[PDB]
Symmetry: D2
Subunit: 293 residues, 4 copies
């Protein structure tokens, strides 16, 4: 059974205005590449090739201009709009027709992940054909996120959205895997006191049915914060330190497509040509003639 992906790349309201007045946050580069390249690359590593990008009406065309129909990276990209920022769960109403009867995965357009064995850690969620799979990650400021409580045996027993008195320091990350129940669960959701359709209600419903796998994303992964000006900066520094150390890029979509065998060496060469006079183009070229373990 094939899994469809959704990147929700919608409005951060005015919270980061004026930095984000002219353009939506997920088109801003983090270091050497546009933000959206990072969650897209995540979906690609989880093996997902059919992807719906959801964003504001102003910006959809900009995302289209940047990513096209995906055919150049061996993907099949489609697009849809979120008129008003009415909750992350709204993705599933908007995405209903695109999901159809398949399994799905939702990733937040501004969430960056890095680490070892990231294929395998996604795999284990990607290969469960039933229920929902989310990830929990220790953070300093759990109040800002969805907080998962574990019992003494490490079983997930409550989820709470931006709690004033968090039950743990474990935050739900912005990567979610779902079966064919998600749309129907989404459709029955009531708005919350904040006026939002919450992804935590979606995930609570799977918990109450005993069908939520909460997999731990360990301290040895980077899950980076793009929610303040400060953190956005920390992230660029973080990526640039890795890339300049290794001479290898994090979350380069072309490279993921090439290594998954979704495009061949001739196609990778054609993608490199129009950027040949810069580092990124030069990087794509070098991938054709280097073995990387």
């Amino acid at each position: 059974m094939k899994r469809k992906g959704i990147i929700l790349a919608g409005g951060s309201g005015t919270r980061l205005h004026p930095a984000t007045l002219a353009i939506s946050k997920q088109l801003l580069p983090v270091y050497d590449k546009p933000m959206i390249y990072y969650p897209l690359s995540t979906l690609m590593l989880a093996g997902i090739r059919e992807i719906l990008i959801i964003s504001t009406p102003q910006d959809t065309p900009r995302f289209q201009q940047l990513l096209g129909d995906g055919s150049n990276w061996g993907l099949d990209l489609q697009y849809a709009v979120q008129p008003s920022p009415d909750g992350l769960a709204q993705a599933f109403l908007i995405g209903e027709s695109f999901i159809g009867n398949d399994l799905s995965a939702l990733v937040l357009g501004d969430n960056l992940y890095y680490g070892h064995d990231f294929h395998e850690l996604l795999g284990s969620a990607s290969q469960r054909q039933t229920g929902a799979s989310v990830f929990a990650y220790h953070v300093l400021d759990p109040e800002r996120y969805g907080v998962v409580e574990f019992d003494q045996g490490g079983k997930a027993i409550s989820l709470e959205e931006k709690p004033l008195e968090p039950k743990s320091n474990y935050a739900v990350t912005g990567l979610y895997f779902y079966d064919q129940q998600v749309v129907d669960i989404a459709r029955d959701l009531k708005p919350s006191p904040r006026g939002e359709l919450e992804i935590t209600d979606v995930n609570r419903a799977y918990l109450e049915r005993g069908q939520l796998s909460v997999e731990i994303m360990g301290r040895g992964y980077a899950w980076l914060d793009t929610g303040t000006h400060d953190s956005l900066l920390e992230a660029g520094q973080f990526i640039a330190t890795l890339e300049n150390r290794q001479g290898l890029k994090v979350a380069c979509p072309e490279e993921i497509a090439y290594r998954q065998k979704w495009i061949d060496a001739a196609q990778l060469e054609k993608l490199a040509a129009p950027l040949a006079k810069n580092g990124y183009g030069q990087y794509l070229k070098r991938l054709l003639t280097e073995t990387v373990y």
Copy 2:
């Protein structure tokens, strides 16, 4: 006599693609605010209130959405397009009608400046009603810029554009002041071997007429580099270290307009309202009730 300003915020070509595929560089934020805020604030400190923003046809509307007509900050902003990126000196052909018979100033949309007595250092160029005035700044990599050579008495005697063997480490910054000759000098320029109308030829012409002042911008000023992904990241770290230290913002246009008395406390309050729930709105508010020396 009054001086008109031009901010050239055009195409950086593909040099910073794909970071810049969705949006032009000068809309990317540096730390808490869009890039273009920094040179605009510079022109404001130099006392210039009538400014032409030149940009690509695709992005003009994004600059317009961000900056409007300037009326809100006591300015008068106008807009023009640069269909093709044919050299910085092109700004004077495109800007001819807007300049009319006045004095002018040109600033690169991606140049950030910071330091003490910046009013005074601009002033001394802004007050010279005849000839041209540029600024020379010691850098490590002068080969990337226009290099000014001085004789033993500190007189400027040659200018050279991206010389392979620079005569000094003094680079010409991207702030230029000009009298009513610039348009005519611009009109007579032939494209260079690179296919560009070079600002260094413009400035050489003033030097050959003995009408170029080259004022030193000292080491105690920051002139920051936004030309690589690395330097852009250095620049955000730099502004954010200053701002978090001081609780005062660098190159905030509203604050410059308020302190120059181009807008009053009532108007500053109205600008603060629609961002009240973020740091930038809160910062504008606090300016109404703090004396800053």
Copy 3:
């Protein structure tokens, strides 16, 4: 069979003078803690509790003052000096008596490692009772290190020390695992043209006997550079970004001792007391009453 550890924390000569005039590099903190805490914590994760710290004669006492005999963290630390910086392999002559007839592991005092499953990746070297095990990591500037060449089947076939024309981009990291042959191999080493006893000759000898495992340390690990002022800075930024994101520390020795069960909750509490008024002390306290996966 038990494995003994050596941290070589010797002289970086004058290369980073004057930053390092007053103190050896491995006592400088990286972000919140002294450099040496990082490789020490690495040895601890590999399960090694008996450790020889080797350093200059000036600085040994400072290392002793900082780390004591280890008894407080469940280790057994001993100390020895390297009079002159005559090569990394010299560690084994100096360490001969301390090694005795056991297996060993050598870590460079200035090498930082971070990532997921780091226990397991060390384990696989730690559990091989015969031969030598090193790690290879893709880097941009292989000329600076020991470069390992692989054949088309991914077999290690040459090692070369700071080659002018590197055969790959794979660098040998500064973590090494060795059987009872290392001392005797070390003793037979000739100085090189540079006047050094090279760790690459030690490792070449194991390769020529077919007893070198070269395990790949993947792009999903951080191996950080502390060899320039710039990289040292990049590292602090890197650690601080992780720690402030997670509210968990990288390479805190006390925490590793506590989680390996080498000290109990009462002892961890006593270590926290004298630092109670700062973040580090507060962090140790919080480890007593939080479950971390």
Copy 4:
């Protein structure tokens, strides 16, 4: 009349333990050079050549090894110890004999300053032969420092030490200038509730005699924070961004001595020799054959 300088580089207690367990904070490098180089360079710019370095008994020899007697940079450096960290005003009891009957200046060993016209701003305090002169600098967190309150005419009217409800955002920096009364005012001070002899009481006494000048250090100066591990890291990023941009170093003592004519080109060359194979030596060399305005 001539002015004597004191750099207090004592115990920061345990506040930054364990980072600082092996070595006192003021020997840690900020980017390319030891911390203490920055305030020492400040005293040098203020024209002061006779300087007492006060530090802990354990570290004095490390400061001596780094700085010698100063003869190499045209200074005269002397050393004293501070057995217990009993307040910044203690510097005048300890320093009594060294001060003798001269004017003085006190600078905190961990305070970094940068900006334009820094000579002039010091000058104006250095030239006032009577009373005391301090500097007030706008900060975000004035509650951590001595806060100066101004009346509507910009006259200083109260000073308060770490007030919970600060009267302004103007913090007193860690650079102080004093006449021959300071010793006697110091001697009459009683310890505060915290067990410290406060520099703010010293400065309040001069205010109550009408002899305190409070000069504004403007926003266009950097006064950097070295009090947390975070800020220390910000400070290195900050210096390194300036230095890599300009190819000129901030607070290099040899360069200040050379430009003040306290050492000649032959002596500067001899200081450059023993570091010739690193950037800092190369930088000193290049100063012999470049004009810097």
